[PDB]
Write an enzyme that holds these catalytic residues in place. Structure first.
Site, PDB file in Angstrom:
ATOM      1  N   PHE A  75      -6.471   4.689   6.961  1.00 14.15           N
ATOM      2  CA  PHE A  75      -5.653   3.804   7.645  1.00 14.15           C
ATOM      3  C   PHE A  75      -6.718   2.872   8.725  1.00 14.15           C
ATOM      4  O   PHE A  75      -6.290   2.337   9.558  1.00 14.15           O
ATOM      5  CB  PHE A  75      -4.712   4.476   8.572  1.00 14.15           C
ATOM      6  N   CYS A 108      -4.655   0.698  11.169  1.00 18.80           N
ATOM      7  CA  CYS A 108      -2.969   0.548  10.774  1.00 18.80           C
ATOM      8  C   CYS A 108      -2.126   0.806  12.018  1.00 18.80           C
ATOM      9  O   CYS A 108      -1.940   1.917  12.658  1.00 18.80           O
ATOM     10  CB  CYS A 108      -2.784   1.286   9.494  1.00 18.80           C
ATOM     11  N   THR A 130       0.959  -1.303   0.078  1.00 23.31           N
ATOM     12  CA  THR A 130      -0.037  -0.007   0.118  1.00 23.31           C
ATOM     13  C   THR A 130       0.750   1.392   0.029  1.00 23.31           C
ATOM     14  O   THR A 130       0.421   2.262  -0.538  1.00 23.31           O
ATOM     15  CB  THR A 130      -1.083   0.178   1.087  1.00 23.31           C
TER      16      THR A 130
END
Ligand code: HEM
Ligand SMILES: CCCCCCCCCCCCCCCC(=O)N[C@@H](CCSC)C(=O)O
Length: 458
Positions: free
Chosen positions: A393, A400, A268
């Site tokens: 996120f 994340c 990502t």
């Protein structure tokens, strides 16, 4: 007060499943959301989920007292190789909180300061590669961003060198990872996954899983044979104890975390860098602003940690790229108990929701009507953005874990890129977004003209 949920076109007994028979499912779902609105039901044989696109409903979905992280079918397939690693474990599985506690310290500010030098090592390799290109050549952007990001998580996290810049073809781990992610994406629309017409896919999937595990074997073996003391992500995975249980991770889970972090820890970010460079070349004035900041702030041969933190506008450019094209484009939730969503949609305990992040980020009621424009200035004051309006996120305790690592790396590299070269969209590249669950431009190429500014050693 209850409303009937919109639903896209159907295909008889297959319901909506065939809408995912495309190599660009997320983009297809975005178009459906544009047509149907903030929420739509999506059915497949034996299952249903609801796609949310508005901040008003997504803010409710992000209430952890009402909803918990769910494993989408995509993540259930990824779990075939990522097991109960952090990304594919349920919040209630013992190994989630345990690994979370053991690994969180690897992303502290102290840890980030410690990773800096190694991030510079790989960033310098990227800059040197470009400085060494001949006049008649060009740059394959996502390919080189992937070389950079995989090498960075490999070195910073595992003291392992993938040496991607020493290869003209993708590193073998990447080839197998991409094939495995592509297979999980492609398996989403198979109504009969066990039909023998898929035996070759299954065989190739196992081969790819083996390639990833053989690499994990080398990383674990190289750490054992190391005479040098390291204190990185792998050190914590191998030796860290969860303060709650007092237990360290077992071997099986460690292998899953290594696979998880090698994949989530680079893919990502390579998408982000690729999309950021794409938007910069398509918006000359924004590129000028970012390049001015890089030249003004990065006054030393190589960037210091504090200087990267001082690249405010570069950071804004990265957040705006994550707004338009969040590279892990969706996340799933399930209702902890019966509850009513947005005062109109009754849900039963267990019902699932999919958050379509690119759509959330295009909610005109939050941003202005100009949601398609690339305007970094939207993030001049991130703290002023409404809660749950920007979620590249994820959410809450399941957000994340590597957000700061990704942003530090991307800000460092993009800053160096902008300091050292002038870029040219020489083919007037037409955005083509490849989907492998995650999103990344495909075929994006540019030409870089060196500003001939010496690079410091290290
Ligand atoms: C701009 C790049 C990145 C983006 C957009 C991103 C996005 C996300 C999202 C959306 C989730 C939540 C998924 C869900 O709810 O199903 C997530 C989870 C996660 N990410 Fe990232 N991520 C990025 C970079 C990284 C990096 C560099 C690392 C490793 C250093 C990383 C490690 C993880 C892990 C381990 C989880 C699962 C955390 C948990 O549930 O305990 N991510 N990420
Ligand atoms: C351990 C490393 C894991 C890396 C995986 C990164 C994943 C990022 C997530 C991208 C989101 C995937 C979106 C797929 C499209 C989608 O809506 N799929 C839905 C379809 C439901 S109908 C059968 C689903 O998967 O359940």
């Amino acid at each position: 007060t209850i409303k009937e949920m919109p639903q896209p076109k159907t295909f008889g007994e297959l319901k909506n499943l065939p809408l995912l028979n495309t190599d660009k499912p997320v983009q297809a779902l975005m178009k459906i959301a544009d047509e149907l609105g903030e929420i739509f039901k999506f059915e497949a044989p034996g299952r249903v989920t609801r796609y949310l696109s508005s901040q008003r409903l997504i803010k409710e979905a992000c209430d952890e007292s009402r909803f918990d992280k769910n494993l989408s079918q995509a993540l259930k397939f990824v779990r075939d190789f990522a097991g109960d690693g952090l990304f594919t474990s349920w919040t209630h599985e013992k190994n989630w909180k345990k690994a979370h506690n053991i690994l969180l310290p690897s992303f502290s500010q102290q840890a980030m300061k410690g990773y800096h030098a190694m991030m510079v090592d790989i960033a310098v390799q990227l800059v040197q590669k470009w400085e060494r290109l001949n006049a008649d050549e060009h740059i394959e952007v996502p390919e080189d961003m992937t070389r950079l990001t995989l090498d960075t998580i490999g070195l910073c996290g595992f003291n392992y060198r993938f040496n991607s810049f020493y290869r003209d073809q993708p590193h073998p781990f990447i080839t197998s990872m991409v094939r495995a992610l592509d297979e999980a994406m492609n398996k989403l629309q198979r109504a009969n996954p066990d039909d023998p017409a898929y035996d070759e896919n299954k065989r190739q999937f196992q081969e790819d899983i083996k390639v990833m595990n053989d690499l994990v074997d080398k990383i674990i073996a190289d750490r054992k044979a190391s005479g040098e003391q390291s204190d990185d992500l792998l050190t914590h995975m191998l030796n860290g104890k969860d303060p709650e249980t007092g237990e360290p991770l077992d071997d099986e889970n460690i292998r899953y975390q290594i696979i998880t972090f090698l994949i989530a820890g680079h893919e990502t970010t390579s998408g982000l860098l690729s999309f950021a460079l794409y938007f910069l070349v398509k918006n000359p004035h924004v590129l000028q602003k970012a390049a001015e900041e890089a030249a003004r702030v990065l006054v030393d041969p190589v960037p210091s940690y504090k200087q990267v933190k001082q690249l405010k506008y570069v950071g804004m450019v990265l957040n705006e790229a994550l707004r338009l094209w969040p590279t892990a484009p969706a996340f799933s939730l399930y209702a902890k108990e019966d509850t009513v969503l947005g005062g109109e949609y009754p849900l039963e305990k267990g019902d699932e929701l999919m958050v379509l992040i690119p759509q959330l980020h295009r909610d005109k009621t939050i941003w202005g009507d100009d949601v398609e424009e690339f305007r970094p200035e939207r993030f001049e004051n991130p703290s002023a953005i409404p809660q749950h309006a920007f979620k590249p996120f994820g959410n809450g305790q399941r957000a994340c874990i590597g957000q700061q690592f990704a942003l530090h790396e991307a800000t460092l590299v993009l800053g160096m890129m902008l300091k050292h070269f002038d870029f040219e969209d020489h083919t007037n590249y037409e955005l083509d977004i490849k989907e492998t669950l995650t999103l990344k431009p495909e075929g994006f190429v540019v030409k870089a003209k060196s500003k001939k500014i010496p690079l410091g050693g290290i």
